[PDB]
Design a protein around this ligand. Structure first.
Ligand SMILES: C[C@@H]1CN(c2cc(-c3n[nH]c4ccc(OC5(C)CC5)cc34)ncn2)C[C@H](C)O1
Ligand SMILES: Nc1nc2c(ncn2[C@@H]2O[C@H](COP(=O)(O)OP(=O)(O)O)[C@@H](O)[C@H]2O)c(=O)[nH]1
Lengths: 125, 872
């Protein structure tokens, strides 16, 4: 049964993988043991997010490094056409912004509204 | 100065004559100085397509050792010769080029090739003839374009290729060989027009599935006949026979199905002759009925006109006696469904001017009573024929729709055509007299029902051609009724197969531009322009009616000219229906689909702000935001710099600096309440309730500062970050809006989840805006009183969710690109939606009854669908 999702919190209808919850909740050990188990690092849910997206959204740079060493997608588009650069520059995560641009980040990515990461960095400090 | 010169004649005549003037396949086109000759082929296989290449500017030479249906005759009628000087003596932008002969082009919508000009017309004539036991498949001739083959009656899609078929008629031994067992109808013509048999065969193998009922019969062809066969008791043998004239013989069994088939076949033959060979009906054509008093002698013939005169009085033929219903069951309507049969003893009517209901250009409709109920009777004029009544009954029978008028009984003795009575009259009288009862719901329902009737008529291979408010009848003025508007007056309704229609009929001022041309072969798309005109009239009420020149289309905008309230998505539909190109117009089904939407009904206004203007807030005359302040008159834009500006509340403004001003970083103003980015809650400075950024405030006192819900003096500091157990912690961790009716509907920054909280201070559920659904992140929340919850997403979607069952009512399509701020205002309660188009600001006004109208429209459509199913 699907009784492992709650363990990482403390798939589904949306399509949430326990790696997503581990990355979002701030747990790095669960992420590390899930990568060894052979999970999916580029799994998209109904919201279109990937573990890197949530990791950039919360602001855990260590988890960002762990998922960037496993071979994730540095530039992935969710349902809104957003990449981890937008989420990192929207919440003032300068360290995550710097770490993202070292693995091949697209700094000129246009979302479905047409904005680039620089636009969100300038509109929110 | 140049013109054509056709050399026509039978095969082998010598058309060896053109060369001296200076077996061919198709048409030979040359040049002869000035005169571009057109040598025709005398072989019978090309005769079907020969008429398509005959014009009036030419100098036809008839070469002899049909065509005539400035001609001079030469042997091998302005002159006569036997075998160059006589030809010269006797001979003395895109459309004009076709007549000259430089290139060929057909602008008629029926052939659907008005965007293809081909030079070298001689190539087309040769190509049309290289394809010709005539029967082939597509792959057979691909290895030796197929839109011209079926459009010239040369290769019908079944590919029949009616030409080159076996001239030898087979030995068809029908059942019921006795005289009292078959009905024989004879058409006598001096000659068969070119392409007549091909056109007749094409028409007959298109109505065969629907000639009896949809069941397909067995079919045979021999290029001058066709045998349709459903059973030993239901067949039809239409073919050519000989006795110095040309005879078309129709044989059917003398039973109910045989009579039905004979009626259908004679109706279709008559319509074919009227549409494509009017010369025979100007009489050259004689129609006979074959009868025998006993079943042992040769048939005798009586003209159909004499038989009609005899059937005018009594239904019996006397010498020995035969009933007319077994000789010509089409004169007396014996082939009709026989449920609509007159009962003259049961009909009472007087035909007085006080009982007149209207006119139909061929008869007058009167008030009457039939079987004890009020009805409408269309007495046909004395200068009419049975053909008009039969072609009206073509539509009034076999077609039953909730948007089409219903027939009850028809007679031949007075030619009466009793119909049903509209309870509220016609739409023309309502537009011109009852201007106050035309609510928006009634207008939309009338348009919807007319569109439904047009769609059904077009689906039934019928073109209406006369769509005016006079022909639209109202059965009730109550908007929530299944039947409101109906279509009548099928006098000029004619069959429209995949061959087009040539005759131009329609009332001036209510017809498509092509029909008014009078020289084009048009199709069912001519009714879409009429429907667009009708929609324009309904929107403008009286309007242009209370003319023809400027509608063929230079009509003004409905709103400014007649001062009618704006109706977006209706003006757009009018514009795309009033198109000069029939192919660009939507079909009747597409028009019905466009009208069948509650977004069309409930969108009251749509105001476009100047480009590159960004709005942050607005209050209701609607004051706008942006340091810069604006104002709008719900149209007029006034803007000036005063300080950006974040919140407005009347007029008190708030800037992201801490300075609040009144004109005769603050984040929330409510009514006075002030919410800054630090957490303080001012009262207007009576007190300060400092608590990060306070951005929400509601009362039904509630609000939210950061990720926590308060109440006020702060009552309940309901912390709401503790919800990461459900949905992402990223979504769980600032509140965008707070909305409360019984629970606390909370939207958060970039969170597609609308949290629900009890006011037990505990979570009660999650609403996923992406599950119902392109960015699903919630921007705005709005409440309608015990009706629905309005959610404005990051995209242009508005989700209407039921307050009780949390079920989706409708997702409003992308009117604009991003819902910024939404509120309900008093304009008539409306919902004010401010959107973006990234940068074009976008203001939309919606009727507050959008969910109710969605439900009402879907229920109405389902009810009408069940009614339409029950009709048949
Ligand atoms: C006001 C008055 C007028 N009335 C009508 C009724 C009709 C009408 N009914 N059924 C029809 C069937 C055919 C028909 O063919 C037209 C469109 C050729 C006139 C009219 C009616 N057409 C005008 N007015 C009904 C009474 C109660 O009310
Ligand atoms: N002996 C003779 N033969 C003729 C005369 N006129 C025409 N022909 C023949 O008739 C044929 C005419 O064929 P033509 O009419 O051009 O074929 P079509 O265009 O398909 O009808 C030629 O092959 C000639 O040999 C004539 O005056 N005398």
């Amino acid at each position: 049964g699907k009784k492992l999702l709650e363990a990482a919190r403390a798939t589904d209808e949306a399509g949430v993988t326990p790696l997503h919850l581990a990355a979002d909740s701030g747990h790095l050990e669960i992420v590390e043991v899930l990568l060894k188990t052979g999970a999916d690092v580029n799994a998209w849910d109904h919201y279109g997010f990937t573990p890197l997206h949530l990791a950039a959204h919360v602001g855990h740079l260590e988890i960002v490094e762990v998922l960037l060493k496993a071979g994730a997608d540095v530039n992935a588009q969710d349902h809104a056409g957003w990449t981890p650069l937008h989420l990192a520059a929207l919440y003032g995560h300068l360290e995550i912004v710097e770490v993202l641009l070292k693995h091949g980040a697209d700094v000129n990515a246009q979302d479905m509204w047409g904005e680039t990461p620089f636009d969100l960095a300038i509109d929110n400090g | 100065n140049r013109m054509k010169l056709m050399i026509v004649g039978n095969t082998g005549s010598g058309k060896t004559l053109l060369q001296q003037l200076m077996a061919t396949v198709g048409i030979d086109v040359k040049d002869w100085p000035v005169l571009n000759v057109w040598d025709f082929a005398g072989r019978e296989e090309f005769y079907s397509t020969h008429p398509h290449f005959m014009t009036q500017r030419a100098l036809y030479l008839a070469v002899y050792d049909p065509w005539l249906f400035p001609v001079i005759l030469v042997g091998t009628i302005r002159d006569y010769h036997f075998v160059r000087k006589t030809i010269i003596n006797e001979s003395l932008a895109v459309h004009f080029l076709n007549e000259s002969g430089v290139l060929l082009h057909f602008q008629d919508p029926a052939l659907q090739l008005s965007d293809l000009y081909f030079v070298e017309p001689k190539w087309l004539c040769k190509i049309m003839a290289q394809i010709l036991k005539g029967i082939i498949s597509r792959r057979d001739v691909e290895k030796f374009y197929f839109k011209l083959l079926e459009k010239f009656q040369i290769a019908l899609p079944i590919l029949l290729v009616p030409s080159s078929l076996s001239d030898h008629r087979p030995v068809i031994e029908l059942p019921h060989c006795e005289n009292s067992e078959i009905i024989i109808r004879l058409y006598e013509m001096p000659y068969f027009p070119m392409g007549f048999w091909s056109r007749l065969i094409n028409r007959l193998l298109e109505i065969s599935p629907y000639m009896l009922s949809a069941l397909r019969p067995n079919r045979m062809y021999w290029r001058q006949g066709i045998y349709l066969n459903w059973s030993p008791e239901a067949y039809c043998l239409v073919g050519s026979e000989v006795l110095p004239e040309s005879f078309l013989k129709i044989t059917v069994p003398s039973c109910r199905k045989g009579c039905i088939l004979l009626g259908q076949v004679v109706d279709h033959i008559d319509s074919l002759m009227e549409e494509w060979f009017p010369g025979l009906l100007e009489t050259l054509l004689k129609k006979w009925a074959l009868y025998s008093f006993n079943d042992g002698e040769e048939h005798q013939k009586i003209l159909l006109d004499d038989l009609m005169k005899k059937a005018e009085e009594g239904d019996l033929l006397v010498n020995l006696t035969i009933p007319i219903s077994q000789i010509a069951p089409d004169l007396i309507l014996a082939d009709l469904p026989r449920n609509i049969m007159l009962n003259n003893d049961e009909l009472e009517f007087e035909q007085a001017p006080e009982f007149l209901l209207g006119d139909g250009s061929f008869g007058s409709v009167y008030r009457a009573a039939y079987e004890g109920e009020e009805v409408a009777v269309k007495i046909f004029n004395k200068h009419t024929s049975l053909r008009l009544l039969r072609q009206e009954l073509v539509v009034l029978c076999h077609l039953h729709h909730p948007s089409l008028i219903s027939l009850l009984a028809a007679g031949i003795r007075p030619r009466m055509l009793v119909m049903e009575l509209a309870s509220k009259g016609s739409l023309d009288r309502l537009l011109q007299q009852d201007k106050a009862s035309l609510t928006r719901t009634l207008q939309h329902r009338i348009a919807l029902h007319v569109a439904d009737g047009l769609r059904y008529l077009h689906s039934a291979m019928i073109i209406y051609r006369d769509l005016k408010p006079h022909n639209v009848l109202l059965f009730t003025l109550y908007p929530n009724a299944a039947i409101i508007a109906k279509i009548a007056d099928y006098s000029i309704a004619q069959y429209c197969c995949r061959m087009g229609i040539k005759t131009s009929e329609g009332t001036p001022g209510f017809r498509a531009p092509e029909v008014a041309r009078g020289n084009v072969i048009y199709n069912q798309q001519a009714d879409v322009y009429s429907f667009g005109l009708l929609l324009y009239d309904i929107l403008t009420t009286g309007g242009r009616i209370v003319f023809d020149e400027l509608e063929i289309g230079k009509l003004p905008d409905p709103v400014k000219e007649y001062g009618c309230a704006p109706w977006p998505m209706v003006e757009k539909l009018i514009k795309q229906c009033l198109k000069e190109n029939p192919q660009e117009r939507p079909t009747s089904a597409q028009v019905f689909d466009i009208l069948n939407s509650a977004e069309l009904v409930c969108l009251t206004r749509r105001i476009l702000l100047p480009k590159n203007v960004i709005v942050e807030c607005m209050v209701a005359s609607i004051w706008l935001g942006c340091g810069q302040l604006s104002f709008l008159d719900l149209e007029g834009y006034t803007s000036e710099e005063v300080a950006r500006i974040l919140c407005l509340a009347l007029i008190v403004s708030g800037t992201q600096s801490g300075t609040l001003l009144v004109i005769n970083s603050v984040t929330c103003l409510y009514c006075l309440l002030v919410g800054t980015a630090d957490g303080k809650l001012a009262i207007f400075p009576l007190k300060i309730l400092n608590i990060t950024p306070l951005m929400c405030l509601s009362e039904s006192m509630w609000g939210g500062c950061g990720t926590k819900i308060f109440s006020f003096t702060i009552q309940k500091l309901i912390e709401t970050r503790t919800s990461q157990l459900f949905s992402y912690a990223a979504f769980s961790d600032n509140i965008i809006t707070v909305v409360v009716d019984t629970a606390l509907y909370i939207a958060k920054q970039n969170s597609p989840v609308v949290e629900v909280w009890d006011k037990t201070e505990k979570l009660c559920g999650l609403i996923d805006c992406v599950h119902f659904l392109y960015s699903g992140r919630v921007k705005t929340l709005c409440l309608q009183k015990n009706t629905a919850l309005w959610i404005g997403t990051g995209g242009g979607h508005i989700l209407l969710l039921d307050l009780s069952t949390r079920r989706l009512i409708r997702v409003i399509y992308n009117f604009c690109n991003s819902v910024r701020v939404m509120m309900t205002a008093q304009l008539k309660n409306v919902m004010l939606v401010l959107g973006y188009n990234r940068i074009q600001s976008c203001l939309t006004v919606w009727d507050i009854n959008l969910p109710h109208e969605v439900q009402n429209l879907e229920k109405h459509i389902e009810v009408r669908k069940e009614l339409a199913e029950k009709m048949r």
